Ligand binder design. Sequence first.
Ligand SMILES: CCCCC[C@H](CC(=O)NO)C(=O)N[C@H](C(=O)N1CCC[C@H]1CO)C(C)C
Ligand SMILES: CCCCC[C@H](CC(=O)NO)C(=O)N[C@H](C(=O)N1CCC[C@H]1CO)C(C)C
Ligand code: NI
Ligand code: NI
Lengths: 168, 160
Amino acid sequence: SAVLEILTAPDPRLRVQSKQVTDVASVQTLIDDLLDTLYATDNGIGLAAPQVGREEAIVVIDLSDNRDQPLVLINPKVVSGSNKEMGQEGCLSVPDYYADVERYTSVVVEALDREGKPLRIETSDFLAIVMQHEIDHLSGNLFIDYLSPLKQQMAMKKVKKHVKNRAR
Amino acid sequence: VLEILTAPDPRLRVQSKQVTDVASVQTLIDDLLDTLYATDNGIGLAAPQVGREEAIVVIDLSDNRDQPLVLINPKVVSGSNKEMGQEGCLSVPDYYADVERYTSVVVEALDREGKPLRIETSDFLAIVMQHEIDHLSGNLFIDYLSPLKQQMAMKKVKKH
Ligand SMILES: CCCCC[C@H](CC(=O)NO)C(=O)N[C@H](C(=O)N1CCC[C@H]1CO)C(C)C
Ligand SMILES: CCCCC[C@H](CC(=O)NO)C(=O)N[C@H](C(=O)N1CCC[C@H]1CO)C(C)C
Ligand code: NI
Ligand code: NI
């Protein structure tokens, strides 16, 4: 068990390549901690383990209004995608910066659910975008990596200020 | 398209002269814009960087490079909230280092037809204006760095 902190850029732990999970029983506590941490944010809808400094390939998502529809993805991978479009994204690890990012709008993701059983999600919903964002975190990528150098400097400046001025 | 000078070049250290006749510098403004838009990566350009002593700056922070900002006789009249931020410079190519700037500024200037302009900003534009305006008094951002860092800068420029 752990108290998890959401890390913010620039922090090299956000750039680590995640490790595949080979012992699903061993990550149940982390999954519940990740869910609690996501549910403690005002606005977050997903969270990836590298964002709390853990190297396991684990993502949690909850798109629901009441936050009672948790989705847990272990070892997720995009196995098909098509129909790229631009859409605004923000990130708990790049707080207070938002920009349009290109993603597939139809995707199939394969993973294990939290009990270790095979999971295959086929979606053209906003969930497709959210899964791609979270899966990017597992390869140490942030959405600002797709932007121009000027926009990346703009983002880092905004993050630094938001983090410095955050209230307790 | 004009040529951008690199340090060490005493023309980068010239104190710029105020512009009193806006019509006579209209050709230079378009020349500065063409020269900036011919760079791979630049977002602003000051007249001393093309060997001219007139107090003129051009800036474009847009993705498509279709929102030029032209500043004649620009002056920082207020600033607050100094912070460190990375800068690079077309006149110190391939050198990047953290430098202190105001993150909230008020700049007074004239637009390209001479009417008064007052820009109050806490955005990234604040940094770019300060960097460009520094060029007009013959300052490069490396002047604010330690001697060891300045020594390094000169080596990097030469290799470019
Ligand atoms: C949009 C694609 C990614 C969503 C996941 C992120 C959280 C995150 O960084 N996951 O790695 C999020 O909730 N981002 C929020 C976000 O961008 N949201 C919240 C839902 C709508 C959208 C507004 O841009 C911000 C406010 C932190
Ligand atoms: C950053 C504040 C001032 C920037 C202005 C300079 C140009 C300059 O030398 N003006 O006198 C620029 O475009 N610099 C570029 C720069 O540092 N950039 C380009 C946009 C983002 C940032 C780092 O990538 C380099 C690559 C030449
Ligand atoms: Ni994110
Ligand atoms: Ni410069």
